[PDB]
Amino acid sequence: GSHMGTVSWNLREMLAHAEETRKLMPICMDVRAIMATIQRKYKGIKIQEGIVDYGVRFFFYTSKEPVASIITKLNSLNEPLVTMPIGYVTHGFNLEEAARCMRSLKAPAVVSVSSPDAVTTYNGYLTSS
């Protein structure tokens, strides 16, 4: 596994993949349901805002940041990623706006969705004809 592009994975598969690939994984802190999951496994890490290299190369972020700025902070690093879309539900965004806003990323990343049929939809927007 080396390519990018959208998939339909869960938190488990993202975490697993991120471990194996050593690739970066961003996490919206706001989603305390994800925080608990990660904090259970990775407990010796105190959650901090920003890069937390501990086991998996995490990037915890605040949903109040503009999708734009938060993307730019990944773009600076230029590191390859795996996550679900950065301005989606985690910004109150629709999947279309999410893709549009997330095209402003300049680092090569895996995206996710909640189901396999949504993959082709979201990728559709990442072409934008």
UniProtKB/Swiss-Prot annotation:
Cofactor annotation: Zn(2+)
Reported impact of I45V: In strain: Isolate Shanghai QXC1
Membrane-topology descriptor: Multi-pass membrane protein
Domain Macro as annotated: residue spans: 5-129
Reactions it catalyzes: Thiol-dependent hydrolysis of ester, thioester, amide, peptide and isopeptide bonds formed by the C-terminal Gly of ubiquitin (a 76-residue protein attached to proteins as an intracellular targeting signal)
Localisation: Host membrane; Host cytoplasm
Top-level taxonomic group: Viruses
Entry text on domains: The hydrophobic region HD1 probably mediates the membrane association of the replication complex.
Function, as annotated: Responsible for the cleavages located at the N-terminus of the replicase polyprotein. In addition, PL-PRO possesses a deubiquitinating/deISGylating activity and processes both 'Lys-48'- and 'Lys-63'-linked polyubiquitin chains from cellular substrates. Plays a role in host membrane rearrangement that leads to creation of cytoplasmic double-membrane vesicles (DMV) necessary for viral replication. Nsp3, nsp4 and nsp6 together are sufficient to form DMV.
UniProt protein name: Papain-like protease nsp3
Lineage: Viruses, Riboviria, Orthornavirae, Pisuviricota, Pisoniviricetes
Parent-protein residues present: 1345 to 1469 of 7073
